[PDB]
């Protein structure tokens, strides 16, 4: 703040109403020239990204096909094996990237273009599905008589690794 006052004290009619006019005139005329320019460029690009997101949506049909990703190359390039025992290959994958996939995925495939566009959350055999038992009823520990030491030694073994995740990391050990 001292440099703005000291240029008002020494000189009076050299750069008071000159320096504080010529660079402030040049600033606002650039700012007036760019406040409509960046805005008009903003609005036109919002239209072009709308027309494309419209055009991606119209070509987006619903009926898809499942397949299996075999590999991935770059000279980007991915090998598709469909569910009709048919193998395919593309130069470019599609709407999903190359670095978010892996071999063994059940991607949604266009029936004509054979384009990868969907993820399809990849279920498996029904046997471990039958092994999934949720909704465990809360059994009060006092139902157990006489075995309360083993209860604690279990709760010391598992529940505190579940709760105090960072107490076991700064100490220097690993929970069993």
């Amino acid at each position: 703040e001292q440099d703005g006052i000291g240029e008002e004290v020494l000189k009076m009619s050299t750069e008071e109403i000159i320096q504080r006019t010529r660079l402030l005139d040049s600033e606002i005329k650039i700012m007036k020239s760019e406040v409509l320019r960046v805005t008009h460029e903003l609005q036109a690009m919002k239209d072009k990204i709308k027309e494309n997101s419209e055009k991606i949506k119209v070509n987006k049909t619903l009926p898809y096909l499942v397949s299996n990703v075999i590999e991935l190359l770059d000279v980007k390039c991915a090998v598709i094996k469909t569910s009709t025992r048919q193998t395919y290959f593309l130069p470019v994958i599609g709407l999903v990237d190359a670095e978010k996939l892996k071999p063994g995925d059940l991607v949604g495939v266009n029936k004509d273009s054979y384009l990868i566009l969907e993820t399809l959350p990849t279920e498996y055999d029904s046997r471990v599905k039958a092994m999934e038992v949720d909704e465990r009823p809360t059994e009060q520990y006092s139902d157990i008589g006489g075995l309360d030491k083993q209860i604690q030694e279990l709760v010391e073994a598992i529940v505190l690794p579940m709760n105090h995740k960072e107490k076991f990391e700064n100490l220097g050990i690993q929970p069993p």
């Binding site: 703005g4 006052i5 008002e8 004290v9 009076m12 009619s13 008071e16 109403i17 504080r20 402030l24 600033e27 606002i28 700012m31 760019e34 406040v35 960046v38 805005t39 460029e41 903003l42 690009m45 919002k46 072009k48 990204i49 494309n52 997101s53 055009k55 991606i56 070509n59 299996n68 990703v69 075999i70 590999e71 190359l73 090998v79 598709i80 025992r85 048919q86 193998t87 395919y88 290959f89 593309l90 130069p91 470019v92 994958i93 599609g94 709407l95 892996k102 071999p103 063994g104 273009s113 054979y114 384009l115």
Partner: protein, 238 residues
Amino acid sequence: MADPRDKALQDYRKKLLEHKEIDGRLKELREQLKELTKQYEKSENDLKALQSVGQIVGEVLKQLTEEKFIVKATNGPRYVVGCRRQLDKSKLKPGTRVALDMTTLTIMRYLPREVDPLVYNMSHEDPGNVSYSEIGGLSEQIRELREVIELPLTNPELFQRVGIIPPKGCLLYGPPGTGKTLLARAVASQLDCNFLKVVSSSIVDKYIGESARLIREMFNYARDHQPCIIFMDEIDAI
């Protein structure tokens, strides 16, 4: 009007509160425009990626003449197709794998090998980032083991100066818990190129020839990739 030291000291202070006010949101307007171009680039990358025909994967049986290539798809019939322009037909070895056009059926791009995503899972995993320091009392056995592995894959000139070919590998037998799987962490952390981990129990199947097909599929990845290590645990099963 005139030239004071008070009014011309307050002349620009009512102005500097505007010229940075009009300038401050310009950086917000340029950054929003820059992200919008980044979003527009990805949309245009989606538009160009919308037109993809897809190429039929097939394999070259043999070469009939200088333009006639007997190829075959993975399940379909056999075709007689040719090449595009500069596809370097001398590389098209009878048994390579190519990508055929969907409609023209001719050869677009040749593909090196397959991966078989079953054995993809025996490739990608981290050992431990361990550094010969999470192991104790074994430096006689360790240095002897590192001697036969590291030296051919690093410095074969010593084996020239002797002449003698280096041998393949070692066996880590021992009563359990001694730390035998901990070494496979160590060699796959430092000087690692291609480290396969075979459990040697999951390679059996209900179909009669499938286990042998897995083994050759494991070794062709080993010839695909140069220097590579195949760790098979527990030979006692198989």
